[PDB]
Amino acid sequence: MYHGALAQHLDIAQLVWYAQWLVIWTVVLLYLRREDRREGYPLVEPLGLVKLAPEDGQVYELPYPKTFVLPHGGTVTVPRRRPETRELKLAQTDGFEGAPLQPTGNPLVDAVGPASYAERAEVVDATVDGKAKIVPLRVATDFSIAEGDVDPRGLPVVAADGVEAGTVTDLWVDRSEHYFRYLELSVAGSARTALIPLGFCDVKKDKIVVTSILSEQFANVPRLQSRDQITLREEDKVSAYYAGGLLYATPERAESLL
Amino acid sequence: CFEPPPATTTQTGFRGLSMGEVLHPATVKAKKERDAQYPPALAAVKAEGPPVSQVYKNVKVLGNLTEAEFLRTMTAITEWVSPQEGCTYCHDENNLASEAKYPYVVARRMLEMTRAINTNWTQHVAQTGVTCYTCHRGTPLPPYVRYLEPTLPLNNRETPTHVERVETRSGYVVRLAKYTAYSALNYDPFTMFLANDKRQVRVVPQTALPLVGVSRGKERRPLSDAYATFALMMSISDSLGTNCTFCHNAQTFESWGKKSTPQRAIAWWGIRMVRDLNMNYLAPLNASLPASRLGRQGEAPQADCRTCHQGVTKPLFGASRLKDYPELGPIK
Amino acid sequence: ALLSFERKYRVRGGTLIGGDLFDFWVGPYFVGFFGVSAIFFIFLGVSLIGYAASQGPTWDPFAISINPPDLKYGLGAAPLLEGGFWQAITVCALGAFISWMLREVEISRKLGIGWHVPLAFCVPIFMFCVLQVFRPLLLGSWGHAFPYGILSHLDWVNNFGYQYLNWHYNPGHMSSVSFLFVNAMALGLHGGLILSVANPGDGDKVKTAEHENQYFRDVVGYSIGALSIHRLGLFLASNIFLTGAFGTIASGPFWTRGWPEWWGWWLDIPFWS
Amino acid sequence: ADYQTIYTQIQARGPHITVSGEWGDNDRVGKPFYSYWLGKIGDAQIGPIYLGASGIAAFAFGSTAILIILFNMAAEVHFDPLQFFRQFFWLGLYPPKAQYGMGIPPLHDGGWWLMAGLFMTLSLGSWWIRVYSRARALGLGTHIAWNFAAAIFFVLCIGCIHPTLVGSWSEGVPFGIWPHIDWLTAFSIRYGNFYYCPWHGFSIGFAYGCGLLFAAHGATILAVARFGGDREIEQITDRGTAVERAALFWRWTIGFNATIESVHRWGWFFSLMVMVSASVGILLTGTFVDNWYLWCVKHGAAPDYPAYLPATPDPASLPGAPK
């Protein structure tokens, strides 16, 4: 007789093969694939002239709402209906839903395409003890550049067009993670500052190089409301602005690479 | 530590199973050259004469040979085993029937064994056969022999280091690693498998599910048996200068038919053959040998796959002298 | 059909090639020139897989197998049913994969994000080539590559391993396995941590960046930090193949013995022999 | 290009932070010290570290495990130092070579192996506790402790439980570098080729999947580092352009997409299942399946191939073969 044998043609391992697969497709389809739907659902679309249904599929695919209780007060519940109210200066290039949109203004300023930002909270990211998290080193006093690294304060910022566009006045540090995230510059020919996220900067000994945008385009870099603080949504505005240059700083960048 | 392209590859299994030999051309060449030293057959003599059984006195095995034939044999024997020493290695200088020296009687028994191998172990040695040269390679002590404990260097013509000496215990694990192609397998497949017929090489089940009655507790073969068998195969592979897929399709090591090559069945026979030589010819020779010869348990030196093969899938790349020396068998 | 936030990103631009021509979406799929070639090859390769498979003795999915040619055809073209198909399917596979890779660049370009993903995706394509193209070229025949079969490809891995007596002792393999195991563990840790912070249990407050650092400083005395654990994961993962490629390439073209014996370079330093 | 994703161009130094535990803040020993080259591709601070009971316990047990293995290993080269250092890899501490069933083997034949097996278990145990607590103490979920449990359970399976189930200690995993490796072939051989174990397959599927996922996730984040994608907690409670762009990348490529939280769920799950699938396969092996190739053959899955060299009958079954 055999260990595991169940019938004329059944055995344990073989049944457990079946159960194994079931556990997997269960967790994957009924759990994880629904967890994936806590942002951006329900899918937005055109509209119908007459429609009346709590369209069933849109209910079935969603998980039950979850709520995070936020560390410094408040709650957030996901999923939730979060339509994009803001007007988008874009226009359909052809007819079909597949068709790409095109900017009708300055996409850098309009913030469409790679220049877009999320409607993040207009609040200031905090450290764990309540302080503003991302702040210039003027404010962040117990913070310092590590011995060995270029201190960009003083250095010129140089744009994609090769032209000096400003001068670095400060570095903003993350005090939760001890990590610089922006440089601040006095814009040349303006009395504004710009922050530029450190990822858009090539840090040389003698200059800071920024390829995303031409010197001209630093003028319309987004403006903070406070000057020693920055909100989550501003971080998004600032970052998206340079990202947009990567497609839009000059006319040929949107076109076929090769 | 590396070897340069190209490699010589063969195919031993259906395309896409990655089965075959992987040979470094230079190594093959160097073994080809060492094996090339097989002395050619002595010129054939016409058999004018009586049986040396009539002519000579103390001739037991080759008694039926004419005189000229017989001395031809004695010349080949001398050239294969004790060339540097000459006839006298075995004979009394002044009396040739004299069994005074142990090489005589040992050599006598080895003519018998040699004729056994060629007559009865045909399913292994086929029509290639062995001669004295196959093991001895021109010295009285064969270069590759096995004691009831691992020893190093494998070629006994090399000088042992301290650590290699069987007495240096700190060197045990290495003596063993070097007999199983450098694995750490803590078994000696020679004494477990090849010295005698006590152990079973197959360790893999032939049913999908565990049979009730042999599958629990002390009913079971310990996992160590699988390690052992692996060790043996590591050894065989290295002995033949080949890899598992010379014999197995690794899909199912336990299966024969399409899952095994002709060379696996030949190897199966060689295990049987080796056990016979060891148990019935070679082990008994501790009676007839000087202490000088014997190992730490008074065991005579014995044979494994290397003793003949010495690193090649066919000994001496398949050279034969079988039609040249019929004395040595097959004996009708 | 569009995610709630998707529409503002759906702008023209970013193509490597083609420009406006295939710059559009079918459903959620960006197409682009390489979407078009990816699909062409897939359909090719999958058609060949069908005809090949149909010429053979089985339609059990585990047992279907399309194999390379006998060693004897060398690096030459082999008859359709005798390795020819396998040859064609391989070309289609490579075309599919690289299309998929370049299509990822175009998507990255349009979204204004780094090209790190298609780059990471080059590692497995590379390893695919080591196994099927490079190592067969070094060894002289397409007959050394692996068969396209769910189970048969394991029989090839098996035998290839045992050609070198014990593949486990292959130093390239040892490095590979270690990366495979570290990365599996680290993905577990990085996932478990981010989840533990965002989902503390009961109604307790979502925690912070400072907690993540604190947890691992506490447990092991070091925290690699948030950006750096992603850079690590991409490194540990990628190195499974980048270091493994050497173990694979070495076997046959640079080492013909068992892999245990390779270590004799250490064991046999005569100083301690 | 984004050099930040390659390394930290300008490092920042600042006062060392401490997030307070709900206990044991007083067991964090050591002075934070900073490495400049570490800081280039990681956080620069090394240390402090938390002591604790579970931790000390873990250390105590593991150190004993190790002393037993090393002492026996040392016995193997008969206490010669140089041969010890030379032969280290080959050296091991083995389970019963003989069939003692579930009987306690003598020290010379597996007795010591059991010992070390015990202390390693308690070592792993105490460490689990520490991994679970620190999370609790810091007000965190225990997802890590749970993922670790599965890993520990796997070890239990191959070290203890499978030998108990079949009723032989001889089946366990030796301690030692090459020896633990040789076991892998010993085990697969006896159980008829682990390639044909379905759960070996699932496990590899998840292991490769971890490679796929951690390459994909790591790269995705570095690729949106410019939009602060690394700050994953706050991209969770407040979706930003980073994880919008991460999602649309994946939606446009493969057609569906995770979120920034859920992708860590997919990640955790895949990691977990490597260990889960593997334990199941070990639990079934020997208990209910003796030969996986033949089990597969039994159930129709196994591939089959033409003879290439002539088919070779088992000699042993011929007419008047020896034994």
Ligand code: BCB
């Ligand atoms: C007996 C034989 C053995 C063996 C033989 C072996 C060989 C022969 C090789 C490895 C290799 C490897 N082994 Mg080893 N192995 C490993 C682990 C590993 C891997 C880390 C490594 C790389 C695998 C690979 O190349 O993937 C390759 C995966 C690829 C190329 C995937 C390409 C994906 C492609 C880009 C896209 C495909 C898309 C789909 C077609 C489309 C999708 C369709 C649907 C989904 C839409 C472990 C953990 C163990 C254990 C625990 O024992 C082990 C045991 C053994 N291995 C045995 C000892 N191993 C390889 C190596 O690197 O060695 C150094 C290698 O060559």
Ligand code: BCB
């Ligand atoms: C050097 C060693 C190799 C190796 C060793 C290996 C082992 C030892 C094992 C697998 C296993 C598997 N392998 Mg193989 N493998 C596979 C694909 C596969 C799957 C059939 C399966 C699960 C893998 C997985 O989940 O990955 C992670 C990816 C995930 C989770 C995403 C989903 C991918 C999806 C499962 C892909 C399925 C592929 C389709 C069958 C292909 C069909 C293509 C066309 C016709 C549509 C591909 C597509 C390739 C290519 C293109 O190179 C490849 C190369 C190799 N594998 C190397 C040759 N593979 C396991 C198995 O169970 O085999 C039966 C297993 O045991």
Ligand code: BCB
């Ligand atoms: C010839 C032998 C083969 C073999 C034999 C084999 C066996 C016998 C087993 C596997 C198993 C597994 N194999 Mg397979 N294998 C694998 C991959 C894998 C893994 C996915 C999985 C093992 C799980 C694991 O990660 O362990 C690594 C992770 C571990 C060990 C967990 C550690 C956790 C622990 C808490 C850490 C503790 C450390 C502390 C410091 C301890 C302190 C120590 C001190 C105190 C002494 C690949 C990718 C390949 C390929 C490509 O060929 C392959 C080929 C083969 N395997 C051959 C067919 N494999 C396992 C399985 O899944 O089977 C069902 C299994 O048991």
Ligand SMILES: C/C=C1/c2cc3[nH]c4c(c3C)C(=O)[C@H](C(=O)OC)c4c3nc(cc4[nH]c(cc(n2)[C@@H]1C)c(C(C)=O)c4C)[C@@H](C)[C@@H]3CCC(=O)OC/C=C(\C)CCC[C@H](C)CCC[C@@H](C)CCCC(C)C
């Ligand atoms: C070290 C880093 C690793 C790594 C990394 C990354 N991995 C990526 C990315 C990154 C970064 C992506 O960006 C890209 C992706 O989109 O993510 C979802 C991708 C992808 N990884 C897949 C499979 C996968 N990754 C494996 C391994 C690793 N990934 C390692 C671990 C394995 C292993 C381990 O076996 C598998 C099987 C696909 C799902 C997907 C390609 C889809 C495609 O290419 O579409 C194009 C092709 C198809 C849809 C089908 C084409 C069919 C051909 C024409 C006909 C069949 C060919 C034949 C060869 C079949 C043989 C079958 C037989 C052996 C049984």
Ligand SMILES: C/C=C1/c2cc3[nH]c4c(c3C)C(=O)[C@H](C(=O)OC)c4c3nc(cc4[nH]c(cc(n2)[C@@H]1C)c(C(C)=O)c4C)[C@@H](C)[C@@H]3CCC(=O)OC/C=C(\C)CCC[C@H](C)CCC[C@H](C)CCCC(C)C
């Ligand atoms: C799929 C998911 C998997 C996965 C998952 C996870 N893995 C985890 C976690 C998760 C989630 C944790 O949370 C936990 C952890 O904490 O991480 C930070 C952990 C861990 N995974 C380790 C090793 C690992 N994971 C492997 C595999 C997988 N992991 C698989 C792949 C492998 C493989 C591949 O073999 C390895 C080797 C350890 C680093 C760690 C446990 C340490 C321990 O258990 O402590 C046990 C304690 C000891 C041995 C103490 C003794 C040590 C000293 C130095 C001895 C000194 C001797 C001296 C003689 C005396 C001097 C005295 C002095 C006073 C003079």
Ligand SMILES: CC(C)=CCC/C(C)=C/CC/C(C)=C/CC/C(C)=C/CC/C(C)=C/CC/C(C)=C/CC/C(C)=C/CC1=C(C)C(=O)c2ccccc2C1=O
């Ligand atoms: C229909 C048609 C003919 C169209 C023309 C257009 C065209 C070219 C269509 C392509 C059609 C084809 C060929 C589709 C096949 C798609 C493929 C290759 C699917 C495989 C998907 C698989 C198996 C993935 C395996 C990995 C996996 C388990 C993923 C699930 C989790 C996900 C979705 C991860 C990806 C992902 C990662 C890695 C992040 O880190 C991340 C971070 C923050 C937010 C989101 C993400 C995110 O989604």
Ligand code: HEM
């Ligand atoms: C060297 C060329 C050599 C000579 C010469 C030689 C001669 C020889 C004769 C003539 C006999 C018969 C003696 C008698 O009357 O019994 C004989 C017998 C045996 N020999 Fe011899 N022999 C020479 C060399 C060697 C060598 C090198 C050995 C040992 C390896 C050896 C052995 C023997 C044996 C045994 C016999 C008996 C044969 C038998 O049929 O029983 N000889 N030899």
Ligand code: HEM
């Ligand atoms: C062929 C007919 C043949 C002869 C002749 C022969 C002789 C022989 C002698 C002289 C000895 C004793 C050596 C010593 O001085 O102690 C001896 C020993 C061994 N032999 Fe031999 N041998 C002949 C054939 C074969 C063959 C075919 C093999 C291998 C299968 C073989 C092997 C051995 C072995 C082993 C020994 C024992 C160790 C030793 O005493 O040297 N011989 N042989």
Ligand code: HEM
């Ligand atoms: C290569 C290192 C190698 C491996 C691995 C291997 C394994 C192996 C196993 C697991 C068995 C047992 C089969 C069972 O349990 O039924 C086994 C048996 C035999 N082998 Fe083997 N083998 C390896 C290599 C080689 C080589 C190079 C050959 C042929 C020259 C060979 C031969 C054999 C034979 C014969 C058997 C049967 C044992 C008997 O019946 O006594 N193997 N092998």
Ligand code: HEM
């Ligand atoms: C030890 C158990 C051993 C093994 C293993 C073994 C294997 C083996 C094989 C696979 C062949 C055939 C190779 C092929 O067909 O390509 C083969 C052939 C011969 N062997 Fe052998 N052999 C083992 C042991 C021994 C010993 C101890 C000797 C010498 C007394 C010996 C001899 C031979 C001979 C001779 C052949 C050649 C057959 C041929 O066709 O040329 N083997 N062996």
Ligand SMILES: CC(C)=CCC/C(C)=C/C=C/C(C)=C/C=C/C(C)=C/C=C\C=C(C)\C=C\C=C(/C)CC/C=C(\C)CCCC(C)C
């Ligand atoms: C007592 C009875 C009746 C029952 C007990 C049951 C029990 C719980 C038994 C358990 C057995 C177990 C769990 C066995 C598991 C075995 C396993 C998985 C072992 C695996 C591999 C081991 C390997 C690779 C390692 C071995 C050891 C070494 C390499 C030496 C270690 C050395 C060091 C870590 C260096 C220390 C010094 C360094 C810090 C500088």
Ligand SMILES: CCCCCCCCCCCC[N+](C)(C)[O-]
């Ligand atoms: C073989 C190992 C386990 C593989 C598990 C595969 C998970 C793939 C999930 C993708 C499912 C996608 N979708 C849209 C159908 O939900």
Ligand SMILES: CCCCCCCCCCCC[N+](C)(C)[O-]
């Ligand atoms: C990695 C090994 C996978 C082995 C799969 C074994 C499946 C057993 C269950 C029956 C499956 C039937 N089928 C499709 C093969 O005919």
Ligand SMILES: CCNc1nc(Cl)nc(NC(C)C)n1
């Ligand atoms: C901020 C995330 N930090 C972090 N994350 C992980 Cl997954 N590991 C570590 N450190 C050790 C376990 C390598 N630190």
Ligand SMILES: [Fe+2]
């Ligand atoms: Fe992450």
